Design a binder for this molecule. Structure first.
Ligand SMILES: [Cl-]
Ligand SMILES: [Cl-]
Ligand SMILES: [Cl-]
Ligand SMILES: [Cl-]
Ligand code: NA
Ligand code: NA
Ligand code: NA
Length: 129
């Protein structure tokens, strides 16, 4: 599913991401924009041989099982394909674990490079939330 901007904002808010670990909704929308372009089916191979999955490009090195990432873990206890669903529940649940791991949203390099410190509220402009 390719979410619209406000559509994703609403779903993330319903799933409890607004101000989760102190990160406002616009931070999460911004991350998803630059990770996946709001496309739940997005997959991208990483240079270490792991793969990133879904709306928030969650990696198979630590977080989900894809059966092809040697030496990796599955800390969200989920097949990586479950992170590609139209329903973002599994991605959100997993993202909550990731953002709690110590470095906050810096876990998403694209967040650090493209969202961090910017006017992230712009990502929820106009949305009826
Ligand atoms: Cl957009
Ligand atoms: Cl915001
Ligand atoms: Cl694996
Ligand atoms: Cl933090
Ligand atoms: Na990534
Ligand atoms: Na894994
Ligand atoms: Na999907």
């Amino acid at each position: 599913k390719v979410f619209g901007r406000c559509e994703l904002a609403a779903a993330m808010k319903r799933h409890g991401l607004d101000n989760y670990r102190g990160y406002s909704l616009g931070n999460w929308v911004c991350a998803a924009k630059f990770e996946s372009n709001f496309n739940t089916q997005a997959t991208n191979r990483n240079t270490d041989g792991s793969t990133d999955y879904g709306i928030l490009q969650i990696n198979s090195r630590w977080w989900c099982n894809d059966g092809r990432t040697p030496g990796s873990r599955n800390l969200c206890n989920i097949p990586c394909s479950a992170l590609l669903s139209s329903d973002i529940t599994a991605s959100v649940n997993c993202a909550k674990k990731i953002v709690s791991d110590g470095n906050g949203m810096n876990a998403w390099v694209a967040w650090r490079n493209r969202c961090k410190g910017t006017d992230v509220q712009a990502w929820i402009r106009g949305c009826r939330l």
